[PDB]
Amino acid sequence: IVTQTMKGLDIQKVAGTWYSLAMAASDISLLDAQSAPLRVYVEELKPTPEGDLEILLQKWENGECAQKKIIAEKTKIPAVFKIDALNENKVLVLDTDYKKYLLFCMENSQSLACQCLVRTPEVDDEALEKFDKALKALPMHIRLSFNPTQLEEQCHI
Numbered sequence: 001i002v003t004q005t006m007k008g009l010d011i012q013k014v015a016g017t018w019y020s021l022a023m024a025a026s027d028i029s030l031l032d033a034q035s036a037p038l039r040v041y042v043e044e045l046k047p048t049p050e051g052d053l054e055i056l057l058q059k060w061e062n063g064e065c066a067q068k069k070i071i072a073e074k075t076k077i078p079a080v081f082k083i084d085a086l087n088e089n090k091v092l093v094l095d096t097d098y099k100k101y102l103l104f105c106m107e108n109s110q111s112l113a114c115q116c117l118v119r120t121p122e123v124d125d126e127a128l129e130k131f132d133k134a135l136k137a138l139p140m141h142i143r144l145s146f147n148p149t150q151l152e153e154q155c156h157i
């Protein structure tokens with residue numbers, strides 16, 4: 001479904017701290033519950049020297065905020081990774097300036113969730129504008145965004 005990818009991505013330059021400032025999904029149920037399946041809060045990206053992507057994140061699971069570590073394997077397209085898990089979910093990098101914001105989507109095989117990542121616990125109105133413009137014609141039915149207080153809490157409580 002997603003046909004916005006970042007050209008010239010240098011995955012090594014996405015390394016480090018990020019915050020999930022906003023999230024949106026195709027289907028309400030993907031983000032609706034607190035333990036909704038795609039309601040995930042990015043902590044750190046750790047690219048490997050081979051160009052795969054180790055992802056640290058938190059998720060609400062079984063009534064608490066759980067730490068996850070997920071591996072997204074590279075493909076022939078630099079902006080597209082495949083999660084080493086049940087149905088091979090695709091991670092697409094739409095857009096990034098490495099130093100402030102990163103937009104990404106995840107999709108299966110037809111469900112979709114996208115996020116606006118930022119480097120700091122601040123509302124970045126220009127990153128959110130780029131996020132909303134990217135989503136404009138994706139078929140999203142739920143959107144969440146977080147305040148700075150929430151961005152500094154586990155699972156954005």
Ligand SMILES: CCCCCCCCCCCCOS(=O)(=O)O
Nearest residue numbers: 038040055059068091093104106
């Ligand atoms: C370039 C940035 C890529 C951003 C990260 C992609 C996050 C993927 C999360 C999978 C969700 C399923 O999560 S699970 O822990 O319940 O299995």
